[PDB]
Amino acid sequence: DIIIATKNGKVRGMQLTVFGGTVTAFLGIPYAQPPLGRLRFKKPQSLTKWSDIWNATKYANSCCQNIDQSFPGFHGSEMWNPNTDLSEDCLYLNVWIPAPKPKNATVLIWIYGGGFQTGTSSLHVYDGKFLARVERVIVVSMNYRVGALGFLALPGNPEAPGNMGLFDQQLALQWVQKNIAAFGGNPKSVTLFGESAGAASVSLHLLSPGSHSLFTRAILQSGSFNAPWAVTSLYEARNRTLNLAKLTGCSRENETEIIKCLRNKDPQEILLNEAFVVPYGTPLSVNFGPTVDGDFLTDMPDILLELGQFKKTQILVGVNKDEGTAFLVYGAPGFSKDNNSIITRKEFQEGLKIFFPGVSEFGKESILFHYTDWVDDQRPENYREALGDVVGDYNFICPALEFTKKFSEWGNNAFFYYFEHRSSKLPWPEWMGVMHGYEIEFVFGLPLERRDQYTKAEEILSRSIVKRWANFAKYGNPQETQNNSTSWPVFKSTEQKYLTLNTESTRIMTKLRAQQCRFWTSFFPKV
Ligand SMILES: *[C@@H]1O[C@H](CO[C@@H]2O[C@@H](C)[C@@H](O)[C@@H](O)[C@@H]2O)[C@@H](O[C@@H]2O[C@H](CO)[C@@H](O)[C@H](O)[C@H]2NC(C)=O)[C@H](O)[C@H]1NC(C)=O
Numbered sequence: 460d461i462i463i464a465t466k467n468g469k470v471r472g473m474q475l476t477v478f479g480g481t482v483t484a485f486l487g488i489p490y491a492q493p494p495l496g497r498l499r500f501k502k503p504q505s506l507t508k509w510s511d512i513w514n515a516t517k518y519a520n521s522c523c524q525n526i527d528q529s530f531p532g533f534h535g536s537e538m539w540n541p542n543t544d545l546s547e548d549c550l551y552l553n554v555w556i557p558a559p560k561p562k563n564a565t566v567l568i569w570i571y572g573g574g575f576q577t578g579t580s581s582l583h584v585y586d587g588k589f590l591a592r593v594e595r596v597i598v599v600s601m602n603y604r605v606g607a608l609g610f611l612a613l614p615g616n617p618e619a620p621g622n623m624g625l626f627d628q629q630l631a632l633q634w635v636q637k638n639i640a641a642f643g644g645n646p647k648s649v650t651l652f653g654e655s656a657g658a659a660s661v662s663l664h665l666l667s668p669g670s671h672s673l674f675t676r677a678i679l680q681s682g683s684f685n686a687p688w689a690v691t692s693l694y695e696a697r698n699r700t701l702n703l704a705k706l707t708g709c710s711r712e713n714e715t716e717i718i719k720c721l722r723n724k725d726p727q728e729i730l731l732n733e734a735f736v737v738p739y740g741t742p743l744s745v746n747f748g749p750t751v752d753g754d755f756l757t758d759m760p761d762i763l764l765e766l767g768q769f770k771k772t773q774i775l776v777g778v779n780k781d782e783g784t785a786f787l788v789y790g791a792p793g794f795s796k797d798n799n800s801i802i803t804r805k806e807f808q809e810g811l812k813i814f815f816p817g818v819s820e821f822g823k824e825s826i827l828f829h830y831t832d833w834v835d836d837q838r839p840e841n842y843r844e845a846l847g848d849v850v851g852d853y854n855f856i857c858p859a860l861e862f863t864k865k866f867s868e869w870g871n872n873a874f875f876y877y878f879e880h881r882s883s884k885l886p887w888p889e890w891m892g893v894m895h896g897y898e899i900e901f902v903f904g905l906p907l908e909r910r911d912q913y914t915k916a917e918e919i920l921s922r923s924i925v926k927r928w929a930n931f932a933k934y935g936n937p938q939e940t941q942n943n944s945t946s947w948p949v950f951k952s953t954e955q956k957y958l959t960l961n962t963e964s965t966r967i968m969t970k971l972r973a974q975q976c977r978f979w980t981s982f983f984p985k986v
């Protein structure tokens with residue numbers, strides 16, 4: 460029986476056996492007032508003390524969100540769907556601590572991804588108990604509001620200021636600052652890490668003055684705020700808030716009573732209309748996401764990054780080899796997870812219309828021209844592979860690389876990785892390759908469980924990644940120093956060295972996707 464006393468009251472955890480050892484888990488600790496009733500769409504309010512012992516012995520509700528129902532019964536998609544009840548009462552966090560209790564452990568705080576419309580910290584691939592057992596770090600993860608409930612914005616209006624889910628994350632970071640020492644953690648050694656929208660979130664905490672003193676270092680897996688999906692413009696945010704009001708019967712003239720009207724709708728009526736606040740959506744649509752609110756984000760983040768207005772610290776950034784393929788089977792013509800999706804030139808052109816609907820005819824031709832002048836027109840999977848690279852380069856890889864360059868130009872050590880091992884357990888077909896999101900299970904150490912049908916080379920790869928991530932968090936340097944591993948060089952603006960992560964051979968390479976990213980970052984923002 461382990462009870463910990465926090466600033467807000469006592470919490471009871473539970474003991475878990477992990478790799479012939481023990482981890483202490485506190486699942487579902489509240490860190491904010493439930494954002495219900497008048498508090499819906501508002502910034503999270505701090506919680507006041509309770510007198511009892513809070514039982515943190517099960518994961519809490521996930522925040523309200525739409526669910527991926529495209530492939531019912533299929534593990535590849537359903538593994539990302541929430542695994543606890545949905546509720547507006549969802550502002551909870553989880554803490555895993557090593558046993559015996561550490562004295563001053565480094566803390567890793569996980570921010571789940573998605574595209575800011577979905578996600579939960581209770582997923583099996585985010586289970587922090589393996590990291591706490593293997594590296595003796597403390598792992599924290601939180602639920603934050605998503606979709607309209609998390610990011611509805613009438614900027615300037617405190618009834619719906621925008622960025623509320625980013626403020627949920629920030630309040631959980633404050634909870635760690637104020638409470639983690641009682642669990643044996645060091646509030647001065649806190650590393651944020653996250654994937655996709657969680658990584659874009661981490662990159663925004665690097666820009667936010669209110670988050671500056673809440674963490675030490677950052678890790679960005681397959682995402683950053685400069686990705687084209689990550690930040691909603693002021694005008695676009697307003698049109699979407701008003702479009703949602705029309706679709707729910709809440710169109711008023713005083714915008715403050717628009718919000719009051721939306722505060723009396725049931726969560727499900729808001730959820731069902733979220734998809735339609737935009738005329739043409741894509742599999743990468745982020746209908747309600749971060750905005751420049753003048754509070755969490757004081758200016759357009761591209762400007763802040765360009766001019767060096769961010770927390771000066773070390774960063775670890777990387778991407779997967781086939782970021783773009785996961786999105787193709789959700790709309791692109793001729794694509795299917797159940798065949799090898801050999802598509803034609805004409806289908807490739809139709810896919811560009813799917814993924815770039817608001818782009819001029821000339822813009823789409825420029826993508827076609829750059830990605831289709833190949834070696835031989837013999838290979839039949841040419842167009843299939845080109846469309847995936849198009850989606851992956853534009854949405855993840857080139858923004859990650861440009862974020863790392865601009866960040867490193869102001870003096871800090873940066874480390875960039877290229878993850879290129881396809882999980883032996885990956886439920887999606889082989890043509891989709893090293894998919895978006897499938898490095899996560901290696902980072903959380905799932906292949907260290909021998910009972911779970913991963914290869915031995917995958918156990919070794921995950922063990923090395925876990926050590927590199929933990930050494931980055933503890934010491935700012937993602938090395939595996941004991942088992943003669945390839946040394947990971949800093950990424951610099953000139954050389955742009957990066958480390959490849961695979962089961963075969965660990966290599967140092969330079970200037971990833973150099974030609975493609977010149978197209979996307981220099982030319983394409985003009986179209
Ligand atoms: C701002 O919103 C308008 C309206 O969107 C319509 O109303 C919403 C409630 C929702 O139902 C949307 O799906 C609707 O599209 C957008 O306008 C439309 O634009 C398309 C093509 O641009 C056109 O074919 C429609 O006729 C337009 N409909 C109306 C009512 O104007 C408009 O594009 C949005 N603005 C931005 C910048 O995205």
Ligand SMILES: *[C@@H]1O[C@H](CO[C@@H]2O[C@@H](C)[C@@H](O)[C@@H](O)[C@@H]2O)[C@@H](O[C@@H]2O[C@H](CO)[C@@H](O)[C@H](O)[C@H]2NC(C)=O)[C@H](O)[C@H]1NC(C)=O
Pocket residue numbers: 791792793794795797798799800801
């Ligand atoms: C690969 O499949 C796509 C998707 O089609 C579906 O999934 C298949 C496995 C099969 O169960 C089909 O019945 C499904 O339609 C195929 O694209 C479809 O092609 C048909 C041609 O008859 C067309 O009518 C549909 O509109 C297409 N659907 C989409 C989403 O594009 C594609 O042709 C298959 N490629 C192969 C077998 O190489």
Ligand SMILES: CN(C)CCN(C[C@@H]1CCCN(C2Cc3ccccc3C2)C1)C(=O)c1ccc2ccccc2c1
Pocket residue numbers: 525526527528539572573574575577655656688742743744745785786789895896
């Ligand atoms: C590691 N992740 C957790 C995996 C899940 N995925 C990626 C897929 C990409 C294509 C399909 N959809 C689903 C999400 C969803 C939810 C309700 C109804 C329909 C659909 C389509 C998710 C995401 O959560 C995800 C979702 C949106 C994104 C938008 C921009 C950039 C990245 C994005 C990543």
Ligand SMILES: CN(C)CCN(C[C@@H]1CCCN(C2Cc3ccccc3C2)C1)C(=O)c1ccc2ccccc2c1
Pocket residue numbers: 614692693694751752753754757758759
């Ligand atoms: C897509 N264009 C780039 C959006 C630019 N704007 C919006 C700001 C805020 C509203 C007023 N001005 C000026 C711009 C201009 C130019 C000539 C004449 C009048 C005006 C109005 C534009 C933002 O990027 C934005 C949005 C919200 C913010 C909130 C706090 C601080 C800064 C913020 C910045």
Ligand SMILES: *[C@@H]1O[C@H](COC2O[C@@H](C)[C@@H](O)[C@@H](O)[C@@H]2O)[C@@H](O)[C@H](O)[C@H]1NC(C)=O
Pocket residue numbers: 562563645647648675933934
């Ligand atoms: C815990 O350690 C604190 C110092 O920690 C660290 O210092 C900061 C600057 C970062 O460099 C971290 O990565 C270091 O690990 C002490 O100030 C504190 O007293 C200690 N508390 C204990 C031992 O209870």
Ligand SMILES: *[C@@H]1O[C@H](CO)[C@@H](O)[C@H](O)[C@H]1NC(C)=O
Pocket residue numbers: 471514
């Ligand atoms: C918390 O859990 C313990 C389990 O040992 C139980 O004794 C106690 O009644 C619980 N408190 C609740 C459910 O409020």
Ligand SMILES: *[C@@H]1O[C@H](CO)[C@@H](O)[C@H](O)[C@H]1NC(C)=O
Pocket residue numbers: 713714715716
């Ligand atoms: C809108 O309504 C709110 C709520 O009653 C009120 O506080 C505010 O002053 C009103 N503003 C305008 C411009 O009508």
Ligand SMILES: *[C@@H]1O[C@H](CO)[C@@H](O)[C@H](O)[C@H]1NC(C)=O
Pocket residue numbers: 922923926939941942
């Ligand atoms: C280092 O190699 C040893 C085998 O000698 C292995 O047991 C250990 O897990 C490895 N550690 C890391 C961090 O790879």
Ligand SMILES: [Cl-]
Pocket residue numbers: 496497719722
């Ligand atoms: Cl109310």
Ligand SMILES: [Cl-]
Pocket residue numbers: none
């Ligand atoms: Cl043509």
Ligand SMILES: [Cl-]
Pocket residue numbers: 969970
């Ligand atoms: Cl070179």
